[PDB]
Amino acid sequence: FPVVLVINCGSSSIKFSVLDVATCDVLMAGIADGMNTENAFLSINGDKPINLAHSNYEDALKAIAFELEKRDLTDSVALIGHRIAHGGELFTQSVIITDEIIDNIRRVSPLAPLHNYANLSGIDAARHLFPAVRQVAVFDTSFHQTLAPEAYLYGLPWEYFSSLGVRRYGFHGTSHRYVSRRAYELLDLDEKDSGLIVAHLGNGASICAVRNGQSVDTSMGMTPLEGLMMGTRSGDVDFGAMAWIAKETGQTLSDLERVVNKESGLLGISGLSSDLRVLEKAWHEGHERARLAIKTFVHRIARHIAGHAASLHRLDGIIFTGGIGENSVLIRQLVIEHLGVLGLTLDVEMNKQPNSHGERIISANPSQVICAVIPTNEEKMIALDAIHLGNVKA
Amino acid sequence: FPVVLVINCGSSSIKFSVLDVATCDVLMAGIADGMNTENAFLSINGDKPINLAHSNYEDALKAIAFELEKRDLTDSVALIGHRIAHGGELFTQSVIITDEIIDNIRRVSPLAPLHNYANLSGIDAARHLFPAVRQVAVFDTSFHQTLAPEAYLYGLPWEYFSSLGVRRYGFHGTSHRYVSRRAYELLDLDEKDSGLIVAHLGNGASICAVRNGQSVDTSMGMTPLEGLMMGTRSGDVDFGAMAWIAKETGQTLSDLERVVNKESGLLGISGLSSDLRVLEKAWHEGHERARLAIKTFVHRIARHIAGHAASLHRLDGIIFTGGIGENSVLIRQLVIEHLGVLGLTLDVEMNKQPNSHGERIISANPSQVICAVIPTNEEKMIALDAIHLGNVKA
Ligand SMILES: Nc1ccn([C@@H]2O[C@H](COP(=O)(O)OP(=O)(O)OP(=O)(O)O)[C@@H](O)[C@H]2O)c(=O)n1
Ligand SMILES: Nc1ccn([C@@H]2O[C@H](COP(=O)(O)OP(=O)(O)OP(=O)(O)O)[C@@H](O)[C@H]2O)c(=O)n1
């Protein structure tokens, strides 16, 4: 009874999950939070958290590795999946990790320095602790590689693209891809003749247009800072406005980077929280700035959804996903009501249902475009890739 | 037989036009190009250009004023219109110029330092040379003031908006407004129950959604640098990408401002020209980068048009205007073909017709949304405001 180990080495943590090959179910999950700080701890399944403070990326994975042998499943690890933040132009699909792949991930690392080097540290450790175990790299960018130059080029001088690699990459590709495949079954659509809009909505949020099974447009750009307004990220912002602010407050681009990336978005406008459940209740309690933060959030989602719809020959479905998209009855309705121009009629009974109802259609019959909620499963998609690649001869 | 004098004091020039009150026709037009430089000249109607080199804003208008008396129409100037680049939150409509208005334009001048101070210099001169002549201020921003907070707020921290005035303003308001009023007659629409998308396309380009006679969304932001890719302007650009470029090339935000504002857009990608007629022929001659510049330009127009459509209850018409929108048979078709998702069928015979055919519908019958070309007339709209305000008692 083989299992697959899914690893995600973020900026400050190592999120892991153990999935059964037979059913793709989660048998174990956890997080090694507080990395590179004098308070590193390992919490599993929401139970008693072990410590091993200020431990490196290699030792933190080694701590989990010992917990796997403690529960007699080290001998059952057949495959290991690694989520990679950035795959540049070099990666269009998931690959088996080899020396070549490590070099290539290290080559595109300058495009996302914080996150990619953490991923490489995660690869390095897992290769040490599991030598005879096949390992797979899954990229957040690879799904958006089917984008045409018109869709990925910026208005900047050509030199920046050809000589520096400045272009749209887009993120949440694994989520967007997974949700898409699932949407073809739920909506009984032909993949080869389909047009979908996927709204991945969480703390990090992006829109993606999927024409005929391929990504044709996505809201995030070279960085996760473009497109939708998010939890702490501002989203689309006038560069002329940013230059003006710099002249007035005396702040530099590095200073404004932190403001835009960590102090903006839902957190920025409301001045309360990045969390929606907080702001939904805050507005319910008559908070003015919380209502405006949500209404702006909703507005910019509808603008991009409808914008991304232009990259389709025909619009068949709009799919909501992510912590917000799966659980927010309000935001979904507000966004859909904001898209009456496309002729969406919402079934509020169906939209009222909590995430426990899983994959579900939330639009009425008279609606021209089908609306649905599909819970994303990035771990499952990484596992499914590893299972597929486990049959390959290298 | 009264006339109206329309003045536009740009960054480097003074564009003027004399319009007849009876028919709103142009009787005289010209430009005082090369302002504040040792080569200032005054060219009228495309005839012999006078000089008066390195002349100030007051003297350059005084040079035109002498040419008006030379053609016996100084005694006929009943009204004078001034185009103002930025009206902040203070101006929602066109006003008669008084001491109060001058103070207020000077108050919002920090929002557009280059252009507003030139406008104030233009007001100052015209007040000197024409003391008993009523003068009107027409703002590029005033039409977009009907925008809701959700549509004009950025994702930035709240403090930047409330304490510094950082918000979307949008431009080409006079064009967008004029084209809208004209679109209600051509499309036989009820203004109080209508939804239009106006694509003002020139060297400076912007989209505007007009719901029920009011602007509800527009592509440009606090500055003319947001939204569509343009002639020399990049348009929408990832701020995370701009910060990354700064770290790599060692350039500052002030340096990148010039790159984004003057070296980007159609000029940036193609590396040839900002002019479309050049690039259309360049692509016809098999130039690769020119084709990509146009295809990107087209792509970003369709993305914003469809994006702005979300701010409408119903989409009735899409209206093309500006040097590009009025004259480009190719770009119009490419953009419309890129919006098949909204069900636009193009009549290519009607789209083939040159601008001489003026206001014209270019979409077929089976098309769900009407497409039309309406030549903008900013001077005429400024005159129509002045005529209206000429009846007022002050
Ligand atoms: N029952 C829930 C759970 C989550 N949320 C909201 O969903 C957001 C978090 O989404 P999530 O996908 O879990 O974010 P991440 O885990 O960080 O992943 P990502 O940001 O990439 O989407 C929060 O704002 C939270 O308010 C919600 O509305 N109701
Ligand atoms: N017969 C013509 C004339 C103009 N153009 C194009 O239209 C653009 C200029 O548009 P215009 O509205 O005249 O620009 P401006 O006068 O500067 O005003 P704005 O930029 O604000 O629109 C140029 O790229 C030019 O190639 C065109 O396609 N065919």
Curated annotation (Swiss-Prot), chains A, B:
Amino acids binding substrate: 83
Pfam families per the UniProt record, alphabetical: Acetate_kinase
Metabolic or biological pathway, per its Swiss-Prot or TrEMBL entry: Amino-acid degradation; L-threonine degradation via propanoate pathway; propanoate from L-threonine: step 4/4
Domain of life: Bacteria
Keyword presence, Metal-binding: yes
Keywords: ATP-binding, Kinase, Magnesium, Metal-binding, Nucleotide-binding, Transferase
Top enzyme category: transferase
Catalytic activity line of the entry: propanoate + ATP = propanoyl phosphate + ADP
SUPFAM superfamilies: Actin-like ATPase domain
Binding site for ATP: 8, 15, 172, 200-204, 275-277, 323-327
Site (Transition state stabilizer): 172, 233
GO CC entries: cytosol
Annotated binding of Mg(2+), by residue: 8, 378
One term of GO molecular function: propionate kinase activity
EC number, as in UniProt: 2.7.2.15
Cofactor field: Mg(2+)
InterPro entries (alphabetical): Ac/propionate_kinase, Aliphatic_acid_kin_short-chain, Aliphatic_acid_kinase_CS, ATPase_NBD, Propionate_kinase
Entry annotation: catalytic residues: 140 (proton donor/acceptor)
Purpose: Catalyzes the conversion of propionyl phosphate and ADP to propionate and ATP. It can also use acetyl phosphate as phosphate group acceptor.
Assembly mode: Homodimer.
The name this protein goes by in its record: Propionate kinase
Organism in which the protein naturally occurs: Salmonella typhimurium (strain LT2 / SGSC1412 / ATCC 700720)
Lineage: Bacteria, Pseudomonadati, Pseudomonadota, Gammaproteobacteria, Enterobacterales
